[PDB]
Structures are given as C-alpha cells and as structure tokens.
Design an enzyme around this catalytic site. Structure first.
Site, PDB file in Angstrom:
ATOM      1  N   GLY A  14      -1.483   3.797  30.398  1.00 60.62           N
ATOM      2  CA  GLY A  14      -2.326   2.609  30.275  1.00 60.62           C
ATOM      3  C   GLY A  14      -1.507   1.341  30.447  1.00 60.62           C
ATOM      4  N   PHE A  15      -0.368   1.286  29.743  1.00 62.84           N
ATOM      5  CA  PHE A  15       0.600   0.187  29.849  1.00 62.84           C
ATOM      6  C   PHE A  15       1.096   0.018  31.289  1.00 62.84           C
ATOM      7  CE2 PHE A  15       0.946   0.622  25.188  1.00 62.84           C
ATOM      8  CZ  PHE A  15       1.081  -0.710  24.795  1.00 62.84           C
ATOM      9  N   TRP A  16       1.270   1.142  31.987  1.00 63.82           N
ATOM     10  CA  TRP A  16       1.646   1.166  33.403  1.00 63.82           C
ATOM     11  C   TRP A  16       0.645   0.444  34.298  1.00 63.82           C
ATOM     12  CZ3 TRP A  16      -0.642   3.548  37.769  1.00 63.82           C
ATOM     13  CH2 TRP A  16       0.126   3.449  38.945  1.00 63.82           C
ATOM     14  N   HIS A  17      -0.646   0.621  34.020  1.00 68.35           N
ATOM     15  CA  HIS A  17      -1.686  -0.094  34.747  1.00 68.35           C
ATOM     16  C   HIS A  17      -1.622  -1.599  34.502  1.00 68.35           C
ATOM     17  CE1 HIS A  17      -3.942   3.781  35.598  1.00 68.35           C
ATOM     18  NE2 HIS A  17      -3.991   3.139  36.753  1.00 68.35           N
ATOM     19  N   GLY A  18      -1.351  -1.993  33.260  1.00 70.83           N
ATOM     20  CA  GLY A  18      -1.204  -3.406  32.899  1.00 70.83           C
ATOM     21  C   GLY A  18      -1.242  -3.603  31.397  1.00 70.83           C
TER      22      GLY A  18
END
Lengths: 79, 414
Positions: free
Chosen positions: B333-337
């Site tokens: 999720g953090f990877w997406h933004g």
C-alpha cells in the site's frame, strides 16, 4: 553424520510421518507441509545444518521432493 | 539544458496504435538478428535509450536528469555491496545497502506528505525499476548471484519494454533468458504470441478501457458527487466501472509490454491470469498484478515470516502468518503512495487475507467435526463455488473503489 539420515529424521519431528522408503513423493500434495509448514522446516533446516537457505530463489518445482531436499542441502554445504 | 529536453520530441509508451509503427521498424533488426543467434549490443542500447528518453521527454522532461542521477546512485550501492559480499556477509550491512537502494523511492513517496509537491528524484519508471535494483542486493545476499557485467546489470534494470510500469523481473531469470537466444521455431512462436498480445492490447486499452474509463466513469462520478452521503447508488456504479477500467487499462498495457519484450527476444513475467474467476482472496493474488504480487510474496512476505520464526516472536503458528500478511500488504500500500486510501487499500487486503485464511482453517476443522460425528463432508458444488466467486469479486471491487481515491472526493472535498 549422514545428510540423508538427518533430513529423514527432521521431517518426522515437526510433522510426525516417516517418508524414508516412499521418498520421491511431492510433500505439498502428500499433505506433509502447510503454507506455513515449509517456513517451519526451513528454520529447523538452518539450525541443524548451519546453512542459510535461499527462499527468494525457491521455485515450486525446486525443493518439493525429499530427494531434492537432501541433494540440495549437500550442494549448499560445501559448494 | 532542461529547456533542451523539453524542446525534444515526445512519445508516450503505447499511447496510440501508430506508436507500434515506430517501435516495429526499430526492433525489426533485433528480431531478424536473433534468427542467426546474434545480438547487436550497441544498437539494442541505442534504440532502448531513444524510447526511454521519448517516454520521459514530456512537459516535465527534467526527470531525465533524475533518471541519470538514479543510474549513478544505483551503480554505486549495487557495486558497493558486490565488493563487500565477496569477503564478509553481515545482516546490517545488507540492511544498509537495501535501505540505500530504496531511499530515492522512499524520498519520492514521502515527499508530497511533507511538501505537497513532488521530489526532484522522481522520474516515470522509478517504482518499477527499484524492484530490479533491490532484487540484486537480495540475490547477492542469498549467495545466488556472484558474477555480473555493468552491461548485464544495466540491460536488466533499465530494460526498455518494461520501463514505465511493465512487469517486475528478477535478475537470474532475466539474465539467463537474455544469455541464451531461443531457437528458430521457438522464436517464431514468440512472434505469433506478440502479434496476438498486440491485437488483445488494442481491444483492452483503446476500446474497452475507453468505454469504462473516459465514457462511463466521468458522468458516474459527477452524479455520485451531487448525490452526497458516505455512499450512494452512483458510487456503486463507479466501483464496478473503475474496477473494470483499472483492469483493462493495466492488463492491456501489460500485454503490450510482453509483446515488445518478445520481439526483443526475452519473455518477461506475465501480470494477469483471469483475475475475476478467482474464488479466493488467496487465489486473487495469484491472478492479479502477478509480477508485483509474486515479488512481494518472495521478497517481503517469505523473508519476513522466516524472521518472525527465527526469533519466535509470536505465540502460535497462525499469528506469525497473520502479522506477515498485514505488514506485507500494507508495505504494498505504501508502495502505491503515502495517502490514506492507498494505506487503506493495503490494510483491506491484509485483514482480507487473514479472514480468508482463517476460514480455510475453520472449514477443515468443521469437516473433521462432521466426519467424526457421523455426518458427510460440508457440500462443495457449483453454487458454493459461485458464491465464493461472488463474495471475492465484490471484496476485490470495493478495494478498487478505495484505491481509486474517489472516496476522497466523496467524503472529504468539503
């Protein structure tokens, strides 16, 4: 000590089923290892053999049968 | 120098059908070459650099410098670890090199939380390139990688067809594929698959994603906004419409990516495998954005589970499995933004997978409860299967509504 004998004796410690004679069985299909059960085997395979096991290169057809587990441990033990 | 790059011609990758005329003509020597078991090393990098540059020469063309910085920065820390790994092998050294390889990506994501504006290090393919870079730090750590050229590392990390968003790859598999050119009729087989994948991609991206995305979605959002409240019927509309739009746009792209890659001789990993017929949340992640999921499975999940089992941090077998799921899907999720809804989208599939797994465990113990009490196993037929598919489909679709960031418009515009 023998590599084949210890792998055979670690498998029936955590899961409790001997597979020495009928050995080329697929351990995922034979109902020996869970989704989580493989992780539990890896940990005890590291503690016993003093080898660190590559799990990010671990394919599905790679280390599925007991003979490929025995033969794979020996390759990582010296080479 | 920035104004020069902005003056430079621009072609968005797979932006239109007429793009493939350029890339088709351009790759034709490479493909013909492979039939005679030869590659044109220099020409392959030139045609790669052209298309990467053309993909980056937008109105923010300045990002080319951010890419140039990135390649230099990665060479430093990849080689730093390579040099180190020969002699010693330590935990924290590996952690430091991992952190440093991902640090530009971390800075790009973290920036608009602090600033409200972009990072200077930001360039288009950054999120997808980083996986290729860390991949090598992880592969060197496991001792499965030892020898590589700067050429081999560069060809892999900044591979042209999979640059912007294309399927995530692992070094050992990419390198071996590139190393041995496939034989004459296997190569012709790839041409057949490439011409197939382009045809499908045309339908997926320019036809279907057009109908869902640019035709149905905008008025549905407009209406949902006028309606108000925390949910309404047009919001149920955007949920499905966007969901299909997301799939068709991304799957079509992925097919183009795979097709161009095929013409370049190598076969990149696939991204989709009929994701909507999945009965399971567990099954869904074996069918949706597979290259990303399969990476996160082996490099974030699997690796984390071992650590929590080495250290035996949690009481039982299943909590270490549950915590690994929630962390792993949240990191994704953090990877997406770093916005509430991407993190939400993360924790969603997190608790989604633990619920899913808990059910599979419960179903097996209910079956043993029945078998020992005399009764026949709990029924498994066409309608239980369909029910599963139905529940999964809507869980998945609701997550894409969160993911779309439309719920930010509906709840928080004020």
């Amino acid at each position: 000590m023998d590599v084949k004998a210890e792998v055979i004796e670690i498998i029936d410690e955590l899961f409790m089923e001997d597979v020495s004679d009928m050995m080329d069985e697929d351990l995922f299909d034979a109902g020996v290892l869970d989704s989580m059960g493989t992780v539990e085997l890896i940990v005890e395979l590291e503690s016993r053999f003093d080898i660190r096991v590559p799990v990010s290169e671990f394919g599905r057809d790679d280390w599925n049968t007991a003979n490929k587990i025995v033969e794979g441990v020996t390759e990582l033990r010296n080479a | 120098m920035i104004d020069f790059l902005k003056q430079l011609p621009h072609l968005e990758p797979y932006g239109n059908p007429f793009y493939f005329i350029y890339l088709g003509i351009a790759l034709l020597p490479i493909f013909i070459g492979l039939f005679f078991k030869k590659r044109f090393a220099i020409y392959e990098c030139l045609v790669s650099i052209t298309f990467i540059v053309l993909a980056l020469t937008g109105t923010h063309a300045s990002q080319i410098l951010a890419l140039l910085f990135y390649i230099v920065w990665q060479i430093i820390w990849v080689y730093s670890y390579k040099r180190y790994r020969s002699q010693r092998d330590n935990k924290w050294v590996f952690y430091l090199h991992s952190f440093l390889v991902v640090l530009p990506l971390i800075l790009v994501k973290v920036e608009p939380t602090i600033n409200g504006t972009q990072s200077l290090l930001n360039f288009l393919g950054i999120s997808y390139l980083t996986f290729r870079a860390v991949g090598m730090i992880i592969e060197m750590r496991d001792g499965v990688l030892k020898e590589f050229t700067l050429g081999e590392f560069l060809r892999f990390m900044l591979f042209m067809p999979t640059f912007t968003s294309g399927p995530i790859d692992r070094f050992k598999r990419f390198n071996e594929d590139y190393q041995s050119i496939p034989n004459r009729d296997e190569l012709l087989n790839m041409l057949e698959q490439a011409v197939k994948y382009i045809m499908l991609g045309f339908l997926y991206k320019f036809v279907l994603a057009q109908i869902f995305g640019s035709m149905l979605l905008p008025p549905l959002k407009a209406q949902a906004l006028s309606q108000g409240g925390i949910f309404n019927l047009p919001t149920l509309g955007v949920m499905y419409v966007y969901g299909f739009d997301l799939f068709f746009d991304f799957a079509g792209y992925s097919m183009f990516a795979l097709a161009v890659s095929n013409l370049m001789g190598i076969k990149s990993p696939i991204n989709f495998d009929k994701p909507f017929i999945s009965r399971d949340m567990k099954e869904f992640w074996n069918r949706w954005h597979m290259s990303l999921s399969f990476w996160f499975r082996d490099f974030v999940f699997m690796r984390l589970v071992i650590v929590l089992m080495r250290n035996k941090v949690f009481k039982n077998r299943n909590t270490t499995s549950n915590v690994a799921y929630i962390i792993n899907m949240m990191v994704m999720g953090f990877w997406h933004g770093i916005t509430w809804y991407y993190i939400a989208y993360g924790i969603f599939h997190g608790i989604g997978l633990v619920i899913n797994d808990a059910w599979l465990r419960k179903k097996k113990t209910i079956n043993k409860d029945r078998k020992k009490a005399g009764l026949k196993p709990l029924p498994e037929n066409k309608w239980t299967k369909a029910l599963g598919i139905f529940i999964t489909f809507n869980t998945v679709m609701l997550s894409f509504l969160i993911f779309s960031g439309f719920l930010n418009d509906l709840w928080f515009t004020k």
